[PDB]
Symmetry: D2
Subunit: 428 residues, 4 copies
């Protein structure tokens, strides 16, 4: 029939694995023929997932470190990229709280439908693509790359290896660059800074990481795979079956059948070492923003895997000024970067920006009506000097871009949008 | 015997209600009570939040000096608006186009998105307010009297004909809308009222839309607030000279598409408003500037014919407010409008601007100073707590304590509850 | 503000539990006050969930037995009710294979998004409401109740007790009458007639049934709760914590940490007895359609709970003429009913009818083009004396109902649909 | 700083238009530079849309003709391909009746949300990809191309030119091979065989066809664009503005302001000639299945455009045996093919196959319970010699494929599906 999307041969895949420095430190317990066997007779190209993953991998090695903020709407990502950031973090917490396909507000317990984060990945990419389209017709060259790589939350996979596989495939279809996966029991999944966490055995999380890599391999894109461990605070594990976990099993049980396990940095290091062959970046949740604890984890892992890159959650679940002085806060990310934490992210930044800004506006509006909104509008005008463009909201969402479509189709159209608008007449 | 749940009322009951309930005092229906019953099948679904919200909205419009609101495009946004003291939520179609519609794309405000997008956001907002209400109950928080503030949502131009209007109204009601607004534009060329290129439809065709919106509410058995919007102040085009009420403004000239040129301004707005009044609970005229005198001229001309007719006013961010008004006039704007009979006033794009500006600000400072910039935000949140802000403790804000209560109701001995052991418990 | 939706008092709830015969055999390990504590300030009425649950309960005690077929589209349920069936079965298997929100074809392993079955419940209710509306304007009183009760698949809850709770809540909101829940590990869930099944402890499934009842109580509707056990074929269990499961543990462990367990009817009887206080109906998956095996199960359960109703899966996963003769097949369901199996269902009926009928049609179309389709249309014509109505496809999907809406809004509309249609012209 | 998805230059695009025979008869009223200006800086590859459209175009010139059946679920399309068909038809009618994103049953009047057909395109492709995957691991070479091209319904574009553009873009994103567009007023859209149809001016539909091509060009795929005219039966048109339409305007008006127009083959021929430069295939809706009327249309169009391919709706809205004898029915498609009708499709095949087969099954089940289902199962067994495979429903939906994923991830898994299943043991 056609040749579009013809799969590579197993030999080509193998050559890529054998010679591409992307795969230098990557262990795969399956073969290239196994990958090909699962690809059918046509492989869909995933342009944004490939481009994002390649850019992300190049950035993690060129930049001193890559940092990001949590984004839960498309407009949020656009502003993050407009303000200079070069990656986007897609928090599952934030999806649970304000952007998931159930319509409900949830705590961070894998309650929402498993295609929710992929939908937001696609949304963020759509929004960045629109900004990219608008910049082109506007001659705006101030942002080098609107298609910033997206690192998305795979939580605990929403089930078994096959649930992991499908979530990774959906993330890739939507244009993800990287995804992270934690060693928690999905049915009891928690945010890293909530209590009641239950670990799964070390080998079961290796299965998760293997499944996530397999899905990427089958989809033929070099997705960055991140392994997160929750062993610092978790005091429960599902089973003592894995000998790597037994040194921490205490013998105490729960009525659910769980096993108590000794928590802290020691089992995090062990698990991190075990995940390293399967992880492009390794991440340990911690209870406080502590540079020394971070350095201890960094050196224990790098003592065995010197080129292993790390990721660090700069969590709003910390009270920052309760633990650190301003001088430490200022240098915090820089100090982590020297330790090998090359991806650093404020997970819930979008939740807090969105809730605080609207509370502050609505509170003043309840008291002073228009005066309170004009304050915001004037702050927007004054922010144009810093590069802010969304004050002219019509062009920001593409009124001019769609006018260009309209006049490409019918140059004599008398129903274009921006001509005669208040934006053209009142905003300079 | 068959269950009697959902038994529809008799036409006599409906007619009795229309005749005696003061809610319907000034409401014309060109169809009969029997026509309504003919469309209801043999079971009528109860719409609790649509009924409650429509009832509360109507009471507030008659009890308060005026009802004001801000546009909300996420659930969390509406929660903060109600937390901050507002008593109604405005659901902007513009904002749904820009950052919250079911296509996943960023759109200008031209009816490009799928027609069930606004109903999904209505349902989302109600779900978010319900969660806030649930949390308040278990926390003993009586600081908000009514968490289920009424939602007024954008019906745009109906996404087609009378039947498309009917189905959108029905979907808004099913999601729990209190009120909905409908504008006299051609849906295939729909514009934001402050964009150019607008095309009116004939006066009688909008009466058909308003009639279809009422019919859908009657068939669904809820007293939804129906708002008529006219775009005749700026639109210089109309599809047809069919209606004799429109003909005095027709010039006779036509565009290459066959549209009729029409003389715009306050005069056709007054005429259309008078024609819409028997079919509208509120009437709203889009305007090119925020002008108290223009609003008064419109108000007096309408109330000369319909003295009890309530009005609505769009305090649009598409105006450059300090270009047109001084601070003193800005401070008194809404209060002066209320005295003229503008009982529902709303800042349409408040959510878009709060969201974009706050993330640009955060992301910009983050790009310069990393963690210092976010700590400024967290510290502002801490200080807002004396004004009633609660989202700094983000875990409880999204229901972690509510779901802990569910979990311990199911199994009081659960060892996997979330708030006990959280960093929120330990640090906030 | 308003009184619409005001919750009942705990005393009112308690009086219902104490005196409504619906609850005569129903254990609740939580209190009426616990329910009230979770309801916030407003309880949404769920008309179709309440009505359907009431009708299903009445039918189970009034009819000799209630039977159903699997339905995966709305039209499918319309034809089931048109042909005289009194209940709809909503198979999770069929949703996985051809009707879930990922858009993918899945085996029956809880791979699809957890709100998929709720959407199909809502869809089936919408389709039945449309048939009910059409019937009303057509004066068609040949079906007593178009709103037949829907029994839908809760699978293994897609996680822990909170995932169970949210799924039950979503099914209710969509209008479900009853829901079934199986004692399987969600992360390894299988169809009852697939291999590789893993049981969860008896107490864990009581937790699931408890959570399902709690969500119904909080939603204030009397949902029918069905317990399914997979212990007939499952040879694995997650844990030996529960002393009721220990008699069947062998001591062997898999590499995953699962416990090997002796499958058969004896564990199913024991689990059924344990589930009975928390289940309105009990169902054991079986490997073959066997009246004696079913009698053995029924007799042993009713020895302890004489009034316990049972449910039976007449599975297409069986090869019926391989096991049974024509005489036994003809009497199968009637015999089961005399044993207490009051709900009997053919799970994958819709998958097989849909797939076979299109293959048959398309195979002939490939060979003989239009002659193959005309054979079908003539069978449809022939079916009209048995009550089939869908040959006239325009009125079947509501063309006449929406014509009635259109002429209610505008009796003089020149754009109604059925007048001048080829249906009016060619189908007498 | 990546080259993935780099856009072509205008010169490359221009050379394609000048040298690829695909475009030899295609008029574009916009430039190649206009296309590039709208592409941003990254162009997403649409593998399935490209392959589908290339395969479709090749098939329309290689085969005697391409015929298809309407499909509304993924499994339906699988059985069509399994039975030997080489294209899929995606009916908007069927989507309105039983497969659209509102969840409601609708008549065919553009009532459903505009992203509904794109989702079904994606669903159909997903289902075919699964059949492809399964076939590969089963060594099944019985179907040469599982990814058969999909021809999908763009109705009247759901608004203006920009709504057209967005629908085409969304169809391509989902993998469509061709799309069709009709010269009706979107707000009054009807099935071609319903009454109350309203035409739009000839130039407005040229604009629609121009927008659909532009969206395909911007997405860089050779989508097949099909122009449908409803002028054979429509007696209304929105305007007299287009001199090409005026010969048929009678001067009579409707109260809405529409213009009566003389319907028949004459205006169809005239509109087809006007659409020819913009349409890869031209389709005239007709009131009866009439070979002579088809010939007149074909001959008059090809008199001016000899190479213009046509398309014909073998509609179930015709009562076939009322108009034609069996011999004419049998030769119908082959006769139309010789006249240049190279794409022929039975639009509502899936609705009638689905509805009749379930009525027939449920009627028998209502009377004879299991006996009626066993008849169907035996027919399925009997169809296996014709190539039917879905009797083994577990492997049909991919239980063997996901088993292969699972064993690729973990060869020692004790929780695979097919080992130990009743399909393995009873369906050998
Ligand atoms: O994010 C914030 O701190 C609020 C920004 N602002 O101007 O409202
Ligand atoms: O076998 C069936 O289900 C009926 C076949 N059919 O579609 O006419
Ligand atoms: Mg997370
Ligand atoms: Mg590594
Ligand atoms: Mg202030
Ligand atoms: Mg609007
Ligand atoms: Mg009025
Ligand atoms: Mg199931
Ligand atoms: Mg019981
Ligand atoms: Mg159609
Ligand atoms: Mg042509």
């Amino acid at each position: 029939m056609s040749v579009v999307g013809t799969p590579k041969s197993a030999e080509q895949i193998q050559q890529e694995w054998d010679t591409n420095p992307r795969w230098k430190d990557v262990t795969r317990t399956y073969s290239a023929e196994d990958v090909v066997a699962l690809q059918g007779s046509v492989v869909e190209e995933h342009t944004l997932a490939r481009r994002g993953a390649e850019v992300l991998w190049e950035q993690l090695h060129d930049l001193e470190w890559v940092n990001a903020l949590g984004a839960l709407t498309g407009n949020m990502a656009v502003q993050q990229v407009r303000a200079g950031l070069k990656a986007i973090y897609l928090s599952g917490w934030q999806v649970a709280g304000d952007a998931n396909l159930s319509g409900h507000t949830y705590p961070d317990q894998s309650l929402y439908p498993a295609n929710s984060v992929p939908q937001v990945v696609r949304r963020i990419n759509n929004a960045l693509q629109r900004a990219d389209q608008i910049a082109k017709i506007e001659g705006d060259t101030s942002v080098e790359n609107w298609l910033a790589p997206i690192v998305a939350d795979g939580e605990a996979g929403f089930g078994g290896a096959l649930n992991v596989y499908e979530l990774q495939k959906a993330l890739i279809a939507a244009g993800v660059a990287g995804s992270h996966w934690e060693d928690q029991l999905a049915s009891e999944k928690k945010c890293g800074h909530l209590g009641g966490k239950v670990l799964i055995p070390t080998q079961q999380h290796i299965r998760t990481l293997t499944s996530a890599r397999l899905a990427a391999d089958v989809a033929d894109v070099p997705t960055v795979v991140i392994a997160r461990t929750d062993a610092e605070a978790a005091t429960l594990i599902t089973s003592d079956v894995d000998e790597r976990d037994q040194p921490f099993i205490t013998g105490e049980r729960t009525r659910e059948g769980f096993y108590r396990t000794k928590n802290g940095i020691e089992p995090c290091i062990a698990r991190a070492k075990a995940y390293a062959p399967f992880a492009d970046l390794i991440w340990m949740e911690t209870g406080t923003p502590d540079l020394e604890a971070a350095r201890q984890f960094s050196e224990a892992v790098k003592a065995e895997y010197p080129d292993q890159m790390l990721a660090y959650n700069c969590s709003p679940s910390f009270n920052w000024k309760k633990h650190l002085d301003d001088a430490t806060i200022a240098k915090f990310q820089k100090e982590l970067a020297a330790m090998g934490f090359k991806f650093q992210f404020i997970t819930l930044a979008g939740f807090h920006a969105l809730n605080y800004s609207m509370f502050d506006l609505a509170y003043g509006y309840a008291q002073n009506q228009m005066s309170a909104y004009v304050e915001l509008q004037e702050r927007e005008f004054a922010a144009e000097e810093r590069g802010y463009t969304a004050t002219k909201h019509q062009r920001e969402v593409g009124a001019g871009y769609f006018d260009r479509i309209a006049t490409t189709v019918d140059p004599n159209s008398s129903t274009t949008a921006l001509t005669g608008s208040t934006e053209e007449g009142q905003f300079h």
